[PDB]
Every structure is written in C-alpha cells, then in structure tokens.
C-alpha cells in the first residue's frame, strides 16, 4: 500500500494557490499530483523539499507516497495544540498537549518553574517565584506559546483566564533565554565525551529520561532552556516532541538521517513500537487521571517548584 504523512493546517498556512485552495478544504493530494507539487516547490518551503524526496528511495531495508492532512503514519513536530496501523509520533492526543509537559517534569525532577491555573481563576498578586524573571512564556489551552514582558503580565493574564486555562513558565533571568534541540534516538558517539555545548548527551536529566520514556525507536527533538545566559546545572528540559520536525534545514537532515540509519521503518523493528506505544499511553493517562480527582480540562491548580509537583494554595 502507501505511507501517509499527517500534517496540520500550520503547514498550509505557512501557481501555488491552485492546489493551496484544494489543500485548504480537500487536502487529498495523490502521487500523480505530487509530481507537479514538487515542481511548484522547486525556510518552511525549503524543508519540505528534502522531506518529500526522502521517503521514496530505499526505506525498505517501494510504496507510493501521498500527502494528506496505509501502513505507516508519520507526522511532524511540533504538532500545534489546535488539532492533535503503525504511527511514528504521539499515540494519544495527551502526548501533544500541556499534560505531557507536566509528565516529563514529574519523572525527571528538573524543569522551569511551572504554574498551571484553572479556568476562571483570578490573580491579585504576582507569585514570588516569577518576580525575578525578565521574560515569561505564556501557553494557553489549545493555542501556541509566546514570550511576554514580565513588567505588564497581570492585566494580560486576567483577561486570558476568562476563556481557557493558562500555563506560566519562566523563560529568562536577564532576557530572552537560549533553546537548543537535541535529536533522538541517541547514537553511541555522544555518550562518551564530557559536557559541552556541541555534545549535550551526557546531562543527568536525559539519563533518567532514557530509562523511562524509551527514546530508542521514536524520532523527534528535546528542547533545553538556559535562563542564565558550561555547567550541567544551567540546562533543564523544556519539551518533548515526536515526529520529523520541519522548522529548520539543519535539524531535518539529522532527523531524517537517524531514520534511514537506525531503521525506524523496518517491519522487524516496527513490531517493537506497538509494545512501546501501548505502554506510554497507559502511564500518561494514569498520571493525568491522578492529578484530576478532547483533552479534559484541569480541575485544580498545580505548581512546580524545587522539583516537586504539588497543589497551589493561593
């Protein structure tokens, strides 16, 4: 049969219009029309050039390729929170949601200060943990994260809490923080050297994540935040994503190469994905239901400080 590449409207939003209008509503490109699609495509557009030309040759260590909004489902990263056989990516929708951000923080024990507020909550005073940061990352339920000045944040938060839940995360102590993505699965080369900016595969945060998340048969990237901008204590995990990320050309080449080298599409190696896929979902749904007594909305207030997740009183 065929292998499909699931995507979101973000790719469409970012002679092209002749099929762009069809993608807006129909979105049912076939291999016959992808021939003209490639010629029309001859940063967001540039990274699409390598992806389509990669899943036709080899990848059998011989199937038609289509483009839909089937034996293998491959998505990209990061899937926007607006929307979302084998599947190389998030299994349940909670993986591509805020609940997964809290889950990874809970297991690792290291992360930025987090404050998840329920819908309708009124803030009268700024929490003391957020009075030192110069920039804050604001994430709404279903929307995309953004960075806003800390000086004027109460007036924006109270207006944004009247529609959906808002997550509060510190971004930088003296300005805009530094974010670096590390592709996974990890090869044996980066587990031998010391801690440097070029080689960050020896952080203790990733060591715990490697033994519980099973980052050996899935692709994606891991983002680390550095608010002190080396030492291992200045980097903390920020987010975990699954799929083939399309936002830069450098990361796409490395991610795609890790697919045709480790063999994340061989049927012998794909049979291990089903066992891993059915294990992550159960643990995530148990953690979500644990702090709860499409994606269900939060009922209580959760705060993350000093590596301990608890209930914020007020």
């Amino acid at each position: 049969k065929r292998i499909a590449f699931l995507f979101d409207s973000t790719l469409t939003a970012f002679n092209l219009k002749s099929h762009a209008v069809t993608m807006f509503e129909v979105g049912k490109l076939s291999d016959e029309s992808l021939d003209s699609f490639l010629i029309e495509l001859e940063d967001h557009a540039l990274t699409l050039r390598n992806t389509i030309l990669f899943l036709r040759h080899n990848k059998d260590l011989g199937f038609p390729l289509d483009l839909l909004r089937y034996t293998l489902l491959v998505s990209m990263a990061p899937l926007t929170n607006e929307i979302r056989p084998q599947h190389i990516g998030p299994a349940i929708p909670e993986v591509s949601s805020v609940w997964f951000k809290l889950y990874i923080y809970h297991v690792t024990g290291q992360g930025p200060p987090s404050l998840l507020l329920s819908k309708g909550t009124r803030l009268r005073k700024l929490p003391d943990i957020f009075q030192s940061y110069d920039r804050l990352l604001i994430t709404s339920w279903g929307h995309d994260p953004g960075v806003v000045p800390t000086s004027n944040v109460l007036t924006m938060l109270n207006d944004a809490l009247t529609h959906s839940a808002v997550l509060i995360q510190g971004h930088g102590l003296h300005g805009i923080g530094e974010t670096v993505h590390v592709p996974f699965p990890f090869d044996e080369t980066e587990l031998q050297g010391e801690f440097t900016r070029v080689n960050m595969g020896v952080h203790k945060a990733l060591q715990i994540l490697r033994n519980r998340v099973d980052l050996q048969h899935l692709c994606g990237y891991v983002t680390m935040l550095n608010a002190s901008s080396t030492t291992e204590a200045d980097w903390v995990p920020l987010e975990l994503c699954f799929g083939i990320p399309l936002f830069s050309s450098e990361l796409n080449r490395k991610v795609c190469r890790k697919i045709a080298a480790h063999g994340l599409c061989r049927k012998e190696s794909l049979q291990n994905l089903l066992h891993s896929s059915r294990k992550l979902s159960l643990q995530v749904l148990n953690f979500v239901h644990s702090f709860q007594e499409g994606v269900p909305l939060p009922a209580k207030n959760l705060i993350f400080k000093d590596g301990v997740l608890s209930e914020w009183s007020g």
Binding site: G120, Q131, A165, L297
Partner: protein, 1038 residues
C-alpha cells in the same frame, strides 16, 4: 458556614475623580459612588466599607500622625470625607461609626486638608467653602474657630512644609499669599496677590527645597522661587508626547512622580553628577488602553517609604506598582544603610539612591537602575443591570460540602461567582456574547445561563443556552443546533429535584427537557394556551402550575413522557394585589398593597419559614404567610436613595439586594443598614496593621521588638517572655508578627543589627513622623561625633555650598533693576565681594539712585581691611539700625568684620529665621552655637509651641546632655530611655557623679510605664539597671 452582612463595590463616577488618599498608616482609601472603601497594598483586598453619606463623595483625606504616642493618645485610625452637599464626616475606621458631622451651607467642598503642625492641638481641619470662604474646623467637637472671606474664587490651597505660618491660595485670577496663619485669630487682610501672564491644573509646594513650589501645565512644569518670584527651571515634553495630568512631589529624595493622560507613570530625579535646574527621567511604566468608556482618574504614592505607586481606574480597577533597584547622569548607592554606614536597598527610596550633590565638583561608585513592576491588581463589579442567583439552600444531606456561592449576571455575557463569607471573587467566566437574562442552578456546582440576541426585522431572535461546571469551566450547549431564527426565551424553570426543565417562548409552545439526560422530552401541541407565568411544586412525579393571559389557572403534572411553598399559593397582578390562596383552607384573602406593578416574588429558604419577599417597581417588601402582617419596608425616596433591580435570599435570616449604582448589599429582615466592624471579620491572609489591635498591645509589641536580645536567644514569639494577659490578645499579637515580610524578619534576627537601626526600622513599620525624624537626625550626629531635606540641621559646609549655587541661578536671570538690587545685597551678605563690585558699577546714568549706588561699590573695596579706623563704622551702623532701617544696616555690619553682632540685632527685632540663616553660612563653629542656643529658648516658649524643632536643633549643636534633660521633662520616657542607652554605647557622656541622677530617673520612669502596660519582663530588666530608685518597683512587682 457563618455569613456576615457586607456590600460589594463596582464602577466609579465622574464625581470621584479626586477622591483618593494614601495615609501614613499604610492603607489606601478611595471614594465609591456613595461609599468609602479601604484597601491594603501588600495584601490587596477590601477591609472595610463605610456607608453614611447621602450623596457622592468628592474628597477623602487621612489623618496626620506627627506627635508622641502614649496611653492617653494611642494609635487610632481617623478619616475625613466630604460630599457634594457640604457635609464633612470624621470617621472611625476601626468601628465604622461616625464621630463628627459638619455642615455649612449646601455647596460641594472644593478641598479639605489636615494641619501638619499639631504639637498643641491635634484635631484641626481646614476646608474650602464656596465661593470665597475658608473655615478652620475642629475634628473633636465640630466647633468653628474663625471664618475668612475673600474676593476671588479659591480652587485649592497648599501649606508650607517648613513655616507653619505661611499659607498659599490658588484663585481663578492669580495667587494669594498669606503670612499670618494662626489657629487663634483669623488673617488680618487680603495679603499679597500676584498676576500670572487660568489653565493652571495644580499648585503645590516642594518639600525637598525650601521656598519653592511647582506649577502644573498641560505641556510644561514651572519651578518658582519665592523671594525672586521668577522661574528657575522648566520641565517640558517633546512635541510627540502625552500631556501631563498630575504631579506628586517627593520628600526624602529630590524627585517627582508624574502622571500622563494615557496612564503612564514617570519618575524624575534631580541631576547631581555630569544654567537652570534639570530633571532626568529614570524609570517608566507601560500605558493602558484608552477608550471613551475607561480612563485613569488619579494616582497616589505611599509617604512612609515612597517606593510604590497606586493607580485608580474608572472601572474600579486599582493597579499597584513597585520600584526595584539593581546594580543619562549617573546615580550612586548611599554609603549609610538604615542610618549608619546584609542590606535591604528596596526597603525605602533613600536606601536606593544617594544624597544630592552639586554637579561639576570632584571611593566606591556603583551604578543603580530603577524599574517599575506591577505586583497588585484589584477588580470590581461590572456596569449596572445585574442578574443575581443564589445556590440551593443548606440541607442535612449536603452539609459536608456546602458553599454559599453567589452568581451575578452581566450585560457582556460574563458570570461572576462570590463565596459570600470572605467577600472574595471566586471565578470569572465568559460564556455568552450578549446580556445574560436569567441564571438557574442544576446542582451545587453546575448551573445554566441563557441570553438572547438583538431582534431582526422579522423579529426572530437567536437563542443561546449553555451548561457550565464551576470546577472545570466547560461550556456545552443544552438545546443544541436550534438555528438562529426562532422565538426568544424569556424565562426557564428548574424543579426542586433538578429532574425536569421547562423552556417557554413568546408564541412557540412549551418544551420539557431532562437535566440529567439532556434530551427533548415532550412538546405541546399548537392548540395550547399562551404561557405567562410558571412555577414548580416544592413538595419521579413533579407538579407545576401556570396561568395564561386569560387568567385561567391550570394544574399539570409530569411523569416522564407566582409564589408556592407548602400549601399556600400567592399570586401577583399589574395592579398590586397579592392574593393568598391555600389548598387546605380553599379561601381567598386579597390584600391590596396600594403599590405599583409587582415584578417578581419569592419565599425564604428553609422548612417552616412562612415569610416571603415582594419586589415592586420602586422598592421591596417582606410579608408573612401564616399571619397576614408586615415585617419591614424599603422605598426608593423615603428611606433609601438608590433603586432596586433584583432581590434574592442568602440564608434563612438574611437577604440579598441589587442596587442601580452597581452594588450588592446583604441585609436582615429589617433591611436596616448596619455598622460592619473589622473585629468579627474573617480574613484569608493576615494583614499587618498595628492600629487594629487594642492600645495596650500596640505599645507592648513595640517594646518587644526594640529590645530583641531577650535572655540571649533571638525570637519573634511571645511564648519565650512573660506577658501576663489573656490568650485572645496573645493570639492576635502572634498573628500580626507572622504577617511580616521575610526580609524584615531576617533583619530583626540579626545579631550585628544595632539598636539605632532597630529604632528606625520599627518607626518605619508604625508609620510615624516625629519618631522617624528624631532618630534620623540623632543617628547621623551620634555616629559623626563618635569618630537638604532638613534646612538648618545640616553641616556648615554642606549648607554653604547650596546657597552659593542658589544665588548663582538668581543672578543669571536678572530682568529689571529691582531684581538686580536684591541679587547685589545677597552677594555682599554671603561674602562674595569680588563679584559684587562689577555688578554694582552697572547703574544707568539716568537712575535717581546712582549716587549712593556708585559710592557703595566705592566703600566695599576699601573697607575689606579691618584696622583701628573701624570703630566709627560700627557706631553709624548701629545708629542706622536704631532709626528703623534694619536689613540695610545689617548688611554694613556683616560686611566689615562683624556677623555675630548682626545676628543679635536681627533676633531682637523678631527676624529669627534670617538670623539662623546668617549664622549658619558665616561664623566659625564656636560662635554659631551661641546664636542657635538662644533660638532654642524662643522656640520653647509657651507662645511658640514648636518644641519639636527645638529638640532637633539641640541635636545639631551636639548638646546630648541637654537633649536628655528636656526629653524627661516632657514625659517622653519611651524616647528618653532609648537615647540614654544609645549615647552610652557610642560614648557621648559617662555615668559620673552628677549625671547618674538623670540616668537613674529615666530608667525608673520607663520601668513604671512598662509595669502599667503589662509587660513584666521589660519592667524588671530596666528596674534592675535603675538601682536605688528602682528598689521600690522591684519589691512591689515581685
């Protein structure tokens, strides 16, 4: 779950633009539509609401605390408010009871302000009565002192921070100066009036520079000097800038707080490091959105520390900004921390930046940066036309999880949830896009709300019905996809068991739904009578009754596919009659209420309650069903000024009323306004305010913190000391101590934090003036002798430099010959004879004063020497004094060799201020002491009553022993004991044979005060140190 009577405030009026004040007690008060609201800054929540005025409030001012505090005059809260009817009410915030009512004529009060000089009388208040009347009132008995009439239109007035006898008036024509203000007699005459070459917005003095005031203009700021009456500095904005709105001067540091039209707050600090005065912008904030409906009114700043600002917005939102320090003229950190050289730079503004200095003059220099951070935000009720609803009443089956939530509707689609015992907003959810018409509750946590859109040409209205769950916030449609063209919904009903639901339309028949299943149940046929009113039966089968437009009554029961309770039916009509139908009696009892059309009527929750509430067009009423009688009445115009929009029941003994001005009030059966007190109030987080405690506990807490090393160990709990009083007071003391900030607590638990810094820190917390000023001067001089804000309390060199800079600016901006005459006189008196000779030789060849003037420059150059031919110069100089001309002769005496003699003549003729200025600039620091000592005696006379200034002057002279003598004489044992201990530690005077009598007396007197207060551990400690005179206290106390 006890519920207390309280009210909620919403939006403000146009008459409350200038009704806000921040007192030294640490509380912020602003004027509502007809109420006074007191809120805190660090806590940011409502504390007490005041209700006595019958009209809008225009002015609110706090009391001034500039006096020694003792048992006779303890810490208390006093507030003054004025309305448009000419009524001034003195308030007691602690009890919420008025003390004095003042009314003269019926005109709005233009301005009211307290008197800062309150050494002899502490209850003096001055207010403006239109059109041209000013009256000095008494805040204790409401007795008029004197009344003065003018011939202008007075708008505002300001008091001189330095000279209590100077008063200034701002009129429509110009500015009027008064130099004879006194509480005993009214002003003599109109005074001096100056014309300005109408659009002035504010006229206030500068508390950082003497004889200086600022003029507020839309695009300019003018700084004027009194003795020259000329502008010495202008502050202007660029062409693409927002015009000014309000300026708030600073005291401890030479700075200005400015407010713009867009809501931006800017801070300007005087230039000090690298000819007119220049102010440089340091920190800026972010403006808010501007629309025709919302706009800022005014801002206030805290006077105790001046490190924060508060903004008041027309919608009822209060924004609190805080100033932070971190390490373009440079600014440097101050060497001295908390009086003397772990640190807390953010404690106050004086610890953030250094003292002012003259630019252009030659160790550690650390740059400092200032930024504004928003740390507080308060919200109020929305615009009027609410729709209120109450949660289901308490029962025996839901007592374990009951919560008295209140639901309030809004015309913008918002839902407001209150908890009704703490008075705090619980949740705020936006559901609909139009005005909410009605709210019904399906459970203790879930409820329904519906809204209708605007009618179209045909008349069909889109209908929106949503189901909301409070813990989650999910909103789901109930009916579903019913389209956007259908008859509107005006009322919905939910039965007692929350099982069945009814929806009624204008012409479409009635539709029954199921709450649990959320499905359509059964639909009436077309041949059905129209629905007017409907109600369920409180007593799987449920009965509901409805009446049609024809007056017929139909009883229908539902089994799957108007007031009523018990066995009594009550019906209303458009005339006002309230029929009382009973099922058992089968008898009709019609009682004509002689009122307007009845809107809606409801009974009281709880079984056995046969009382109801009836809402009319212009009031509400309470009736009894068992016996047909009347309980209480409320009429708009007779007893209550405001109207009523909606009524509801809170508990079996309280009711909820909604007013037209945007306020919700909870009353009793009598519906009589009560006096809410802060003692029974329950608060979520603690509030630090020593004034709320009893007078015997506020003083006890101060002594405990002042002497921290109790039995060696350091602690902030009373459990380690012996304090024989009741547990209720002890618990209150513990709560307040735990409310202190973490940084303040760390500073107290500091072994190297000396006593002098502790006195300053405690005084800052209590928000007093006299205590803070005394310790600031004493600490600086004690440290200096051990090794501009204050005019005459500075050093000789520091004072001299600023006067030289001051006279330089005056000489630059000379305009006429008369101004030149003053400048020449000043320069000769300061000793700059070299530069005065050339200025004197500039007189035109036409002036009639050319002959003396040319010879005066002739005299100054040849008189610079002082030999044996100087005796006759004094003789004629003293003769010139005797004939009337004083200042003209004092110039000659000081010019030759003799400044000390000139000072004595000035003091004899009554120019005390000028003599001190002359002695401070010139003369060595051996003869200047004698001049100031004579000035101290005059200030201590019973007719001058300025003993506060006399104490500070003695501290400057260094006569510490004299300060100790006078402090004990004025019954200041609390201050006297601390000063003696500090002087001994820093080595000011030793315990010798003649000084031991005073030291023993002060400790004994302080020990007696502690014993009367109740603190025994402090009494025994100080009595032991007393010695022979403390033996009697030890024998009787032990």
């Amino acid at each position: 779950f006890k519920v207390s009577a309280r009210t909620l405030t919403g939006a403000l009026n146009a008459h409350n633009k200038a009704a806000v004040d921040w007192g030294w007690q640490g509380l912020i008060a602003y004027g509502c539509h007809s109420l006074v609201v007191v809120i805190d800054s660090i806590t940011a929540q409502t504390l007490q609401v005041l209700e006595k005025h019958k009209a809008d409030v225009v002015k609110v001012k706090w009391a001034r605390e500039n006096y020694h505090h003792n048992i006779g005059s303890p810490y208390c809260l006093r507030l003054a408010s004025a309305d448009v009817n000419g009524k001034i009410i003195v308030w007691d915030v602690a009890a919420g009871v008025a003390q004095c009512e003042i009314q003269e004529h019926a005109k709005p009060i233009q301005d009211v302000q307290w008197l800062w000089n309150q050494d002899a009388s502490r209850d003096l208040l001055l207010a403006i009565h239109p059109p041209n009347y000013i009256v000095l009132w008494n805040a204790d008995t409401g007795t008029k002192l004197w009344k003065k009439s003018y011939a202008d239109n007075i708008l505002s007035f300001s008091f001189d921070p330095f000279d209590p006898s100077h008063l200034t008036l701002l009129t429509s024509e110009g500015i009027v100066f008064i130099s004879d203000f006194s509480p005993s007699k009214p002003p003599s005459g109109p005074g001096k009036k100056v014309y300005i070459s109408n659009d002035c917005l504010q006229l206030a003095y500068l508390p950082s520079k003497r004889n200086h005031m600022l003029l507020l203009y839309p695009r300019e700021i003018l700084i004027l000097d009194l003795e020259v009456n000329q502008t010495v500095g202008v502050i202007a904005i660029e062409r693409t800038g927002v015009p000014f709105l309000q300026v708030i001067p600073c005291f401890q540091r030479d700075g200005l707080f400015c407010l713009h039209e867009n809501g931006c707050i800017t801070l300007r600090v005087r230039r000090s490091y690298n000819q007119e005065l220049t102010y440089d912008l340091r920190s800026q904030c972010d403006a808010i959105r501007v629309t025709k409906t919302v706009r800022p009114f005014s801002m206030v700043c805290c006077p105790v520390n001046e490190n924060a600002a508060a903004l008041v917005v027309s919608d009822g939102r209060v924004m609190i900004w805080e100033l932070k320090s971190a390490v373009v003229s440079p600014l440097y950190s101050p060497v001295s921390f908390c009086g003397i050289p772990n640190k807390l730079p953010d404690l106050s503004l004086d610890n953030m930046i250094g003292q002012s200095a003259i630019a252009g003059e030659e160790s550690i220099l650390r740059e400092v940066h200032l930024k504004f951070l928003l740390t507080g935000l308060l919200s109020g009720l929305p615009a009027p036309q609410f729709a209120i609803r109450m949660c289901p009443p308490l029962t025996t089956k839901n007592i374990k999880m009951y919560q008295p939530l209140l639901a309030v509707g809004t015309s913008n689609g918002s839902v407001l949830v209150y908890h009704l015992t703490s008075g705090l907003l619980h949740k705020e959810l936006s559901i609909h896009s139009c005005e909410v018409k009605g709210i019904e509750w399906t459970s203790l946590t879930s409820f329904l709300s519906f809204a209708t859109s605007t009618p179209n040409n045909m008349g069909l209205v889109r209908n929106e019905l949503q189901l909301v769950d409070l813990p989650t916030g999910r909103s789901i449609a109930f009916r579903g996809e019913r389209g956007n063209d259908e008859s509107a919904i005006e009322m919905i009903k939910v039965s007692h068991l929350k099982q069945y639901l009814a929806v009624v339309f204008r012409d479409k028949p009635l539709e029954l739904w199921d709450v649990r299943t959320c499905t359509l149940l059964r639909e009436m046929s077309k041949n059905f009578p129209t629905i007017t009113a409907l109600e369920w039966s409180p007593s799987a089968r449920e009965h509901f009754v409805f009446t049609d437009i024809d007056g017929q009554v139909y009883h229908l029961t539902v089994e799957g596919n108007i007031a009523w309770k018990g066995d009594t039916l009550v019906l209303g009509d458009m005339d006002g009659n309230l029929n009382f139908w009973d099922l058992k009696g089968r008898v009709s009892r019609g009682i004509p209420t002689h009122r307007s059309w009845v809107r809606k009527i409801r009974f009281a929750p709880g079984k056995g309650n046969q009382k109801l509430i009836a809402m009319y067009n212009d009031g509400a009423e309470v009736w009894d069903t068992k016996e047909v009688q009347m309980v209480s009445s409320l009429r708009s115009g007779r007893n209550v000024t405001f109207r009523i929009l909606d009524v509801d029941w809170c508990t079996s003994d309280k009711v909820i009323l909604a007013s037209d001005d945007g306020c919700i009030r909870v009353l009793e059966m009598s519906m009589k306004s009560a006096c809410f007190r802060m003692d029974e109030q329950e608060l979520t987080e603690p509030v630090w305010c020593p004034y709320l405690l009893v007078p015997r506990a506020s003083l006890a807490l101060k002594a405990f913190l002042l002497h921290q090393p109790w039995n060696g160990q350091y602690s902030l709990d009373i459990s380690h000391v012996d304090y024989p009083e009741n547990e209720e007071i002890k618990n209150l003391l513990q709560e307040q101590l735990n409310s202190l900030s973490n940084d303040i607590k760390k500073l107290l638990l500091d072994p190297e934090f000396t006593l002098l810094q502790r006195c300053l820190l405690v005084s800052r917390l209590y928000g007093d003036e006299s205590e803070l000023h005394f310790w600031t001067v004493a600490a600086h001089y004690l440290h200096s002798l051990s090794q501009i804000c204050y005019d005459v309390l500075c050093e000789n060199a520091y004072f001299q430099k600023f006067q030289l800079e001051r006279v330089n600016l005056q000489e630059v901006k000379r305009s006429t010959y008369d101004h030149t005459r003053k400048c020449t006189d000043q320069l000769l008196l300061l000793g700059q004879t070299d530069r005065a000779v050339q200025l004197l030789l500039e007189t035109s060849a036409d002036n009639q004063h050319y002959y003396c003037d040319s010879l005066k420059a002739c005299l100054v150059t040849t008189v610079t020497s002082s030999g044996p031919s100087q005796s006759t110069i004094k003789l004629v100089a003293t003769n010139m004094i005797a004939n009337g001309k004083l200042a003209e002769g004092v110039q000659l005496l000081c010019l030759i060799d003799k400044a000390a003699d000139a000072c004595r003549y000035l003091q004899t003729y009554g120019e005390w201020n000028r003599a001190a200025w002359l002695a401070k600039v010139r003369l060595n620091p051996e003869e200047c002491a004698d001049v100031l000592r004579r000035w101290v005696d005059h200030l201590c006379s019973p007719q001058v009553n300025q003993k506060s200034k006399a104490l500070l002057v003695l501290l400057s002279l260094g006569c510490f022993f004299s300060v100790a003598e006078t402090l004990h004489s004025m019954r200041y044992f609390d201050r006297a004991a601390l000063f003696v201990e500090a002087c001994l530690k820093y080595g000011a005077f030793e315990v010798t044979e003649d000084t031991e009598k005073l030291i023993t007396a002060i400790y004994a007197d302080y020990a007696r005060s502690l014993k009367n207060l109740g603190f025994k551990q402090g009494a025994v400690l100080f009595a032991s140190k007393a010695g022979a005179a403390g033996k009697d206290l030890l024998n009787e106390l032990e």
